[PDB]
Amino acid sequence: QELANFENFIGATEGFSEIAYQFTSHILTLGYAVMLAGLLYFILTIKNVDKKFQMSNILSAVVMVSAFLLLYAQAQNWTSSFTFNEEVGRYFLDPSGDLFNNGYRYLNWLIDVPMLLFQILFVVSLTTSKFSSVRNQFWFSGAMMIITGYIGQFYEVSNLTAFLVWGAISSAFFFHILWVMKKVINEGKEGISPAGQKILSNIWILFLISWTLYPGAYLMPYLTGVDGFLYSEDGVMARQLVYTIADVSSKVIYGVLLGNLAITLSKNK
Ligand SMILES: *C/C=C(C)/C=C/C=C(C)/C=C/C1=C(C)CCCC1(C)C
Ligand code: NA
């Protein structure tokens, strides 16, 4: 079966029900729509925070631009890649199209991950850690996590062993990032108001959950085993839903909370 991602595989073999095709289209559209809304939010509220914090708002806005453009591209790629067959009454991979391509999302991650990790360092103050050290660790492990993930996904269909091994390597970098971010949160909570500490607690939980959704969605088609319930259009729907929840959470909600933290920090006098 010529296609080499899971979406194309399902599209070429079983096809997508009307519901699966339309749901996925709508959730991807909601994704980019929220980023555009977020972009305007972060621009318009930039004056609500003190100058010293504004780099966080700037980085949120730039993340919104990248996410809007690339998630818009991904959404159009979805609808362009699958076309209705009247005889069967399902949507199949269109040989006339460009085929579904995970590249848009992975590029978004490569760009956004370093900016999301960076931006908290303009709101919290470290204690015993160095800014440059934390930044460098975030950026190195962030890049390596996405690169190794991207290598992995090439083997999603063709070599489950490679897919899982590269995934595990990627997960090692992810665990490093979690370790560093937890340290940043802990140092950030030192020497701020309890209201600020509460927001940071919430940021940590949001970060932990929203970022873990990504490897969840990576594994999704296989979480019920091969020829499992999720090894299907339902796995495709679940993956894209989970990615979209993760995107809104990790980018928009995260940015909103950091803005709220910045506002709170200024209230001590
Ligand atoms: C706005 C986009 C963000 C915050 C993207 C984050 C992406 C990840 C945390 C990806 C993690 C992965 C693993 C930990 C293992 C499987 C491969 C990845 C790349 C999905
Ligand atoms: Na179509």
3-state secondary structure the chain: CCCCCHHHHHHHHCCECHHHHHHHHHHHHHHHHHHHHHHHHHHHCHHHCCHHHHHHHHHHHHHHHHHHHHHHHHHHHHHHHEEEECCCCEEEECCCCCCCCCHHHHHHHHHHHHHHHHHHHHCCCCCCCCHHHHHHHHHHHHHHHHHHHHHHHCCCCCCHHHHHHHHHHHHHHHHHHHHHHHHHHHHHHCCCCHHHHHHHHHHHHHHHHHHHHHHHHHHHHHCCCCCCCCCCHHHHHHHHHHHHHHHHHHHHHHHHHHHHHHHHHCCCC
Residue 217, amino acid: A
CA–CA gap between residue 91 and residue 13 (Å, rounded): 10
Tokens at 164, concatenated: 């899982």
Ligand nearest 90 Cα, by number? 2
CA–CA gap between residue 163 and residue 172 (Å, rounded): 14
Closest CA to 167 of 109, 219, 203, 132: 219
Distance between Cα 172 and ligand 2 center (Å)? 38
Closest CA to 245 of 225, 216, 204: 216
Closest CA to 246 of 116, 151, 101, 114: 116
Task: Measure CA 36 to chain center.
Answer: 16
CA–CA gap between residue 102 and residue 214 (Å, rounded): 13
Tokens at 28, concatenated: 């991807």
In sequence order, which residues have a C-beta less than 8 Å from that of residue 96 and are 6 or more positions away? 83
Could you identify the atom of ligand 1 that is nearest to the CA of residue 67?
1
Closest CA to 120 of 45, 47, 196: 196
Could you identify the atom of ligand 1 that is nearest to the CA of residue 146?
19
The CA-atom distances, in angstroms, between 232 and each of 152, 160, 195 are 20, 16, 46
Q: Which residue has the least CA distance to atom 5 on ligand 1?
A: 109
The experimental technique behind this entry is X-ray
Task: Identify whether the C-beta of residue 180 lies closer than 8 Å to the C-beta of residue 145.
Answer: no
- Structural domains of the chain, with CATH: 1-269 (1.20.1070.10)
Distance between Cα 79 and ligand 2 center (Å)? 4
Q: Which residues pair with 85 in a beta bridge?
A: 90
- Up-side HSE of residue 222: CA atoms within 13 Å toward CB? 14
Q: Which residue has the least CA distance to atom 19 on ligand 1?
A: 149
Which resolution in angstroms does this entry have?
Answer: 1.8
Q: Is the CB of 211 under 6 A from ligand 1?
A: yes
Dmax (CA) for the chain in angstroms is 71
Q: Probe ligand 1: pick from 105, 174, 176, 178, max atoms within 8 Å of CB? A: 174
- Up-side HSE of residue 170: CA atoms within 13 Å toward CB? 23
Task: Identify whether the C-beta of residue 264 lies closer than 8 Å to the C-beta of residue 220.
Answer: no
Could you identify the atom of ligand 1 that is nearest to the CA of residue 116?
4
